[PDB]
């Protein structure tokens, strides 16, 4: 099946932490990632992108220590810094196990799909969220998925969140089609 192929591709992308961690929840995260179109997963694998699952804070990892005390883009005024943030995506992907669900220190519909969408945007699609075409869609639809001072202000955030709605499950896919029809069509066409 296509889901099994996607799990095989993810086996060459996902990295588990050293030490004790919740293996069942790490498996559940992989299973949710396996719903992403295989073409994107294959491209991530070819670029040697790793999806790092973590059992502690992101900034406790040596490669993210430099973000200690840094206020993420869009998180101004929250009293929080990267120390508090459970997921990161872009040139790399790093994710705290257990923090997938919306509301666990973040507002994404799913942590791992949202972070991985940033990596797909940046690595696979050469920052398409900042293209004129997507900016035009974002101008119209970017306040229709909640969190207007974040998703509605940063097109790369609206891209990542939309991508997560499209791929998490049938209900979020349906909600995106209703709320953001142009974004939905854009994502459908990208995966063709």
């Amino acid at each position: 099946t296509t889901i099994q192929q996607n799990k095989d591709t993810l086996s060459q992308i996902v990295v588990f932490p050293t030490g004790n961690y919740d293996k069942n929840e790490a498996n559940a995260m992989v299973n949710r990632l396996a719903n992403i179109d295989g073409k994107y997963l294959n491209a991530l694998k070819q670029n040697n992108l790793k999806i790092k699952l973590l059992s502690g804070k992101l900034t406790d990892e040596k490669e993210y220590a430099y973000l200690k005390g840094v206020v993420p883009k869009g998180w101004e005024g929250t009293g929080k810094t990267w120390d508090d943030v459970p997921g990161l995506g872009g040139s790399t992907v790093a994710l705290r196990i257990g923090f997938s669900n919306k509301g666990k220190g973040h507002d994404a519909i799913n942590l791992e799909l949202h972070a991985t969408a940033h990596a797909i945007d940046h690595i696979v699609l050469n920052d398409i969220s900042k293209s004129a075409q997507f900016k035009q869609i974002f101008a119209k639809e970017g306040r229709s998925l909640g969190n207007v001072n974040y998703l509605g202000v940063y097109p790369e955030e609206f891209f990542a969140e939309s991508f997560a709605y499209y791929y998490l499950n049938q209900d979020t896919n349906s909600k995106l089609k209703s709320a953001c029809p142009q974004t939905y069509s854009f994502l459908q066409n990208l995966a063709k």
């Binding site: 973000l67 869009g74 040139s91 955030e157």
Partner: peptide, 4 residues
Amino acid sequence: EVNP
């Protein structure tokens, strides 16, 4: 490149 990094994004929350």
